[PDB]
Write a protein that binds this DNA or RNA. Structure first.
Ligand SMILES: [Mg+2]
Ligand SMILES: [Mg+2]
Ligand SMILES: [Mg+2]
Ligand SMILES: [Mg+2]
Ligand SMILES: [Mg+2]
Ligand SMILES: [Mg+2]
Ligand SMILES: [Mg+2]
Ligand SMILES: [Mg+2]
Ligand SMILES: [Mg+2]
Ligand SMILES: [Mg+2]
Ligand SMILES: [Mg+2]
Ligand SMILES: [Mg+2]
Ligand SMILES: [Mg+2]
Ligand SMILES: [Mg+2]
Ligand SMILES: [Mg+2]
Ligand SMILES: [Mg+2]
Ligand SMILES: [Mg+2]
Ligand SMILES: [Mg+2]
Ligand SMILES: [Mg+2]
Ligand SMILES: [Mg+2]
Ligand SMILES: [Mg+2]
Ligand SMILES: [Mg+2]
Ligand SMILES: [Mg+2]
Ligand SMILES: [Mg+2]
Ligand SMILES: [Mg+2]
Ligand SMILES: [Mg+2]
Ligand SMILES: [Mg+2]
Ligand SMILES: [Mg+2]
Ligand SMILES: [Mg+2]
Ligand SMILES: [Mg+2]
Lengths: 49, 176, 187, 104, 50, 159
RNA sequence: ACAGAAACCUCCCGUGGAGCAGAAGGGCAAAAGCUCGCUUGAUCUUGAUUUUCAGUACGAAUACAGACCGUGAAAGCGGG
RNA sequence: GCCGUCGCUGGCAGUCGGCAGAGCGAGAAAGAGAGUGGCGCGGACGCUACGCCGCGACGAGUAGGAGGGCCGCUGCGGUG
RNA sequence: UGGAAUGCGAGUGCCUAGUGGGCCACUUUUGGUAAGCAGAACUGGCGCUGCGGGAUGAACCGAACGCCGGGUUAAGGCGCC
RNA sequence: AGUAGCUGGUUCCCUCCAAAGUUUCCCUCAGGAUAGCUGGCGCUCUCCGCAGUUUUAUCCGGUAAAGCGAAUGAUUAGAGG
RNA sequence: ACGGACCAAGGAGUCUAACACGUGCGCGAGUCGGGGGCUACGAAAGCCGCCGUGGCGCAAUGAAGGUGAAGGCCGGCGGCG
RNA sequence: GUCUACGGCCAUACCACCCUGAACGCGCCCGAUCUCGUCUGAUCUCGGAAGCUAAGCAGGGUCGGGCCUGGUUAGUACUUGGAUGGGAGACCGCCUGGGAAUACCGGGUGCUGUAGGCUU
């Protein structure tokens, strides 16, 4: 029941990234912010949540 | 790519996907220099895709680990085989550096192609790094340090922290 | 900012009747109470129908109430209407009926009472069966109004049996070009 | 006095402001268009479907009486499994009473 | 925002900047996180992050 | 401004493939269509009678009528704001039995089956299609030879 | 043989490189071309449908249905 | 934090008082039901129900539309 | 076992104003030597729209607006203004 | 108080929704009618359906590329008969 | 680009007929006296039904002459077969 | 094994040349009174059965042409989306995904349905 548990959660509203984005307009592999940062999502979560 | 911070020296292996035809394909090790493993796997796929008929989807990364230095307390002489593009054409190079780490010398090579040739971090393609014996080096900027009794003074010691005494009585001294 | 669209944010249902009469605004008070304080979805339908305009709650005929209360099973039930119960002069026999409507015309009170049926009101019904057990909700034909014959596909269009707006109907009032296969065409 | 000649610029957005909706898929679609001779014989089939009624019950009630001799012939851990049973408002009423009595 | 990226950022319920949601991965999901790639920064959450 | 010709812009759409000209095969005419068949349109240019208009070539629809040499089908047409249900009398040579519904049918019968069974053994089988899930964990045996080492090649101005 | 670059006869090769009234495109080989035989489906009459489209007309067109017909041993094909 | 709009087609006639017994926020469809046998005389507010109360989400705007004005002007029937 | 995933209450009916001069941008694109030129396609904008940046600015980058306090950012920046 | 498809004006607040310069026809091109987009009033149900989305099957297409020792058309050079 | 020195007062979607939809009200297969008549405000209000003539609604369709809105089972008789 | 009639997909079946075909058939062949048709019994139609696999036809062959299917070409060309990337531009690199076509080099060279024969 993942569909139902994840849909019971109102989508989280997070603050701005404390410290600040690297570059919003370019992929994470381009030294930016967008895209998939597999392991490193938690470093962003701690400074955003 | 973007040569952020100091580059790490990563050892990535990876293989194509298992199929009915090739029940097990050969593994393929590469030697990537990148800020972090997320960029190292992406340059592993850039290269493997430029060499083998193999894509990120059609394959998989078997291991992506950082390889440390075997003697980070010995000054070494690294020689690198570049491959980059200018506004008009693309050229191979060979540059030498004195450093303690291989990833250190590669960071210094990215900052050096950036300084001298204005080559952004994505045009460059390191193809071979090798620790060279001091008697095989070629660049005179690196051979000049191969002296046992080296000796030189720091002749013009420009005053830093110009603003802590910002308003002072005495004038600064540069001889030391 | 959020990227939602407020095109349909305002639901247009009737929160209350538009009339200002006080024998309806008291029924709507009693049934708004029953509607919220009971778990019977009957009162909620009666309340939602007491709001509706005079064109959305149409009249019932005595004959249509006959044939809708003669259906097997629904004997000894009270036929609830929210509009009015008009007469139907083209029916000769009338049974006994328990009825509850807002109005009953002075020639349908006669027939129903001479038959021997009861004519309740909505307050009498609310006292007889609060949750509305033993009832039969009805409503007259809504597309009966002559208005609904001009609606649909516009006339002069392949297979659009829609009535046009004409001053008078006759030989020489919209019968010439878009109707004759001879003169021009027809749809 | 030359004016712009033709465009479709805003059109693909006006189309979607009220959505692009597939038509109303109803069961029992109309029979207009079907060939005459066939749709003429289907009407003769319906017009006479009643002609075999008193014979149709003789079989529906037959296989419905036979429905009698048809059917009447065949006729994660022990801990969190016991706690999820004591904590049942109905099923655990007596395992709960057995505990309430436990402290006397 | 493009219309194809605005329909997917609203089936991911991300109707607002810095909104976040959880997403289970498969082919049909990764192929949407590829469509909306320039608008999101997604990854694999730790247990402490959840 | 273009012309409104019935066949403007069909030089390639209605042409026959390479080395597939000439007489049309007869399996085209000896296969059957019954009201409800999901049929896809592909205008063949050899036979000219009953050719579907170019705006339907490549669409799919369902049959609702059948005459001697032709059926009538109901294809959806996107018209400038909306999707009408249009009824066209396409001749038989401009039709194929679309094998799209087919796989759904061969999955329906496979479900009705696997539900008939697994009902006496009390077990529970999976009847839904699940998306290709993330691949599970495995060991990659490097039996003997270590991974070959790759490296970029120098540049060669082979122009 | 006269006969020539080119008349007419004959064998061979010939996927269409010809022809199908016209512009181009598509299609066409025991044919849709060429030559004969018989003919007038280029007739009468309902609605449906497609094309342009507003999804209105006209024009044109596709599927039938009812008659009467032509052709052919027939299956069929034909209401330009 | 405050204002407003929208939604919950939300809640409140239960102010049921010495003719009394003060409840319906709690994870689990349904009765704090009936009968049948083994001293001190006391208890805030509310409810113009077109009223009052509680919850969330939302808040740009020309042309245009709609609503609400215990906004304003002059006279008329009532009423202060 | 309501037969892929994710999301979201939908369906329908009347009456209807304004509009029917548009312009700009990435990419594709026709005429032209080209044009702040003429002409199309897709999406996003300006028009109807403030705000931070680009000294300045219809259209570029960020980001869309009830009135306020604290905190953090985007795009841009950090000798002095 | 002649007509004007033409010019200029068109009077109080707040709240809510919010465009178009596009289609077809017109002695139409400074204007209309029409479809679109908009608002208003609702109603029928909910308390299965739908989607500017992907997945999996399944058709469709003649652009980018490529080709001329493959048809059409263009076209350089030798060599062997 | 045009109007605007200043201030006061005046100043622009009105009324009638027709139509359509929505809405409130009375009666409801009926409905309505609007014309006529009878009995200070009052030129109002009330009343008439043998004043409902007539309008609209209750029947459509055809150019018209005209026609004008479920049936089924059962026996008994004649006819075909 | 294989052939005849009618076929299905219509070159893996087509084209050129060569070799072998037992038996039944399939054919060539012999005639023109009758059916029918021509300049012509060549074709067509008709009545036959002395002759023969010569040919059609079948099978096989060819460092065969073609066709079919693979590899290389090539993660190349091209390409969806992205950047306050580079360049004066022309264009180019990179991230995220998809991804071709020659030349060149390999393999294959008809499967099959119903009915009826031969191989007793
Ligand atoms: Mg800080
Ligand atoms: Mg951008
Ligand atoms: Mg907001
Ligand atoms: Mg708005
Ligand atoms: Mg215009
Ligand atoms: Mg022939
Ligand atoms: Mg016929
Ligand atoms: Mg607003
Ligand atoms: Mg104008
Ligand atoms: Mg322009
Ligand atoms: Mg201009
Ligand atoms: Mg304007
Ligand atoms: Mg706007
Ligand atoms: Mg803006
Ligand atoms: Mg500037
Ligand atoms: Mg602030
Ligand atoms: Mg500054
Ligand atoms: Mg005037
Ligand atoms: Mg609205
Ligand atoms: Mg004008
Ligand atoms: Mg003007
Ligand atoms: Mg083309
Ligand atoms: Mg090209
Ligand atoms: Mg002027
Ligand atoms: Mg002036
Ligand atoms: Mg004034
Ligand atoms: Mg009315
Ligand atoms: Mg032998
Ligand atoms: Mg002979
Ligand atoms: Mg031979």
């Amino acid at each position: 029941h993942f569909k139902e548990a994840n849909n019971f959660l109102w989508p989280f509203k997070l603050s701005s990234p404390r410290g600040g984005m690297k570059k919003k307009t370019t992929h994470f592999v381009e030294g930016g912010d967008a895209g998939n940062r597999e392991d490193q999502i938690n470093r962003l979560i701690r400074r955003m949540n | 790519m973007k040569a952020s911070g100091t580059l790490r020296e990563y050892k990535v292996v990876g293989r194509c996907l298992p199929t009915p035809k090739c029940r097990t394909p050969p593994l393929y090790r590469m030697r990537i220099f990148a800020p972090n493993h997320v960029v190292a796997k992406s340059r592993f796929w850039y290269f493997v895709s430029q060499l083998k008929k193999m894509k990120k989807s059609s394959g998989e990364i078997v291991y992506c680990g950082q390889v440390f230095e075997k003697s980070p307390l010995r000054v070494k002489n690294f020689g690198i085989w570049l491959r980059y593009d200018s506004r008009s054409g693309t050229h191979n190079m060979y540059r030498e550096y004195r450093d303690l780490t291989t990833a250190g010398a590669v960071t210094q090579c990215y900052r050096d192609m950036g300084a001298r040739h204005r080559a952004r971090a994505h045009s460059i393609q390191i193809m071979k790094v090798e620790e060279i014996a001091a008697s095989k080096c070629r660049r005179p900027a690196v051979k000049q340090f191969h002296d046992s009794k080296i000796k030189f003074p720091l002749p013009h010691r420009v005053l830093r922290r110009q603003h802590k005494p910002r308003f002072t009585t005495k004038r600064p001294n540069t001889f030391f | 900012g959020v990227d939602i669209r407020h095109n349909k944010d305002r639901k247009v249902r009737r929160k209350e009747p538009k009339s200002q009469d006080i024998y309806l605004r008291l029924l709507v008070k009693l049934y708004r109470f029953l509607a919220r304080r009971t778990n019977s979805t009957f009162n909620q339908v009666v309340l939602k129908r007491l709001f509706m305009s005079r064109t959305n709650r149409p009249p019932l005929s005595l004959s249509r109430m006959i044939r809708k209360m003669k259906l097997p099973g629904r004997e000894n039930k009270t036929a609830v209407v929210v509009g009015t119960v008009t007469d139907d002069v083209r029916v000769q026999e009338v049974p006994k009926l328990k009825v509850c409507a807002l109005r009953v015309t002075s020639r349908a009170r006669s027939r129903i009472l001479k038959a021997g049926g009861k004519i309740l009101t909505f307050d009498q019904l609310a006292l007889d069966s609060p949750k509305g057990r033993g009832t039969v909700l009805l409503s007259g034909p809504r597309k009966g109004r002559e208005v609904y014959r001009h609606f649909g596909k516009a006339p002069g269009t392949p297979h659009s049996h829609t009535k046009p707006y004409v001053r008078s109907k006759g030989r020489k009032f919209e019968r010439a070009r878009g109707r004759r296969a001879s003169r021009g065409y027809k749809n | 006095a030359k004016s712009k000649n033709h465009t479709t610029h805003n059109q693909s957005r006006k189309w979607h402001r009220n959505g692009i909706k597939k038509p109303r898929s109803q069961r029992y679609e109309s029979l207009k268009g079907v060939d005459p001779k066939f749709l003429r014989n289907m009407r003769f089939a319906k017009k006479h479907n009643k002609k075999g009624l008193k014979k149709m019950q003789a079989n529906n009630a037959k296989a419905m009486a036979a429905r009698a001799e048809a059917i009447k012939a065949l006729v994660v851990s022990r801990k969190l499994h016991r706690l999820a049973y004591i904590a049942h408002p109905k099923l655990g009423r007596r395992a709960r009473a057995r505990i309430a009595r436990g402290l006397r | 925002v493009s219309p194809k990226v605005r329909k997917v950022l609203q089936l991911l319920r991300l109707r607002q900047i810095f909104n976040g949601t959880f997403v289970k991965l498969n082919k049909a999901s990764i192929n949407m996180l590829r469509i909306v790639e320039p608008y999101i920064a997604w990854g694999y959450p730790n247990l402490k992050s959840v | 401004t273009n012309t409104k010709g019935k066949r403007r812009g069909t030089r390639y759409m209605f042409s026959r493939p390479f080395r597939k000209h000439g007489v049309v095969p007869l399996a085209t005419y000896m296969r059957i269509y019954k009201k409800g068949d999901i049929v896809d349109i592909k205008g063949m240019g050899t036979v000219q009678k009953g050719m579907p208009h170019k705006c339907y070539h490549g669409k799919t629809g369902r049959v609702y009528n059948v005459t001697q040499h032709a059926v009538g089908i109901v294809v959806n047409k996107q018209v400038k704001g909306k999707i009408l249900a249009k009824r066209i009398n396409v001749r038989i040579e401009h039709i194929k039995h679309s094998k799209s519904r087919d796989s759904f049918l061969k999955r329906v019968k496979e479900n009705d089956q696997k539900k008939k069974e697994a009902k006496e053994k009390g077990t529970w089988v999976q009847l839904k299609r699940q998306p290709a899930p993330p691949r599970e964990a495995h060991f990659v045996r490097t039996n003997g030879k270590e991974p070959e080492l790759l490296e970029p090649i120098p540049y060669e101005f082979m122009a």
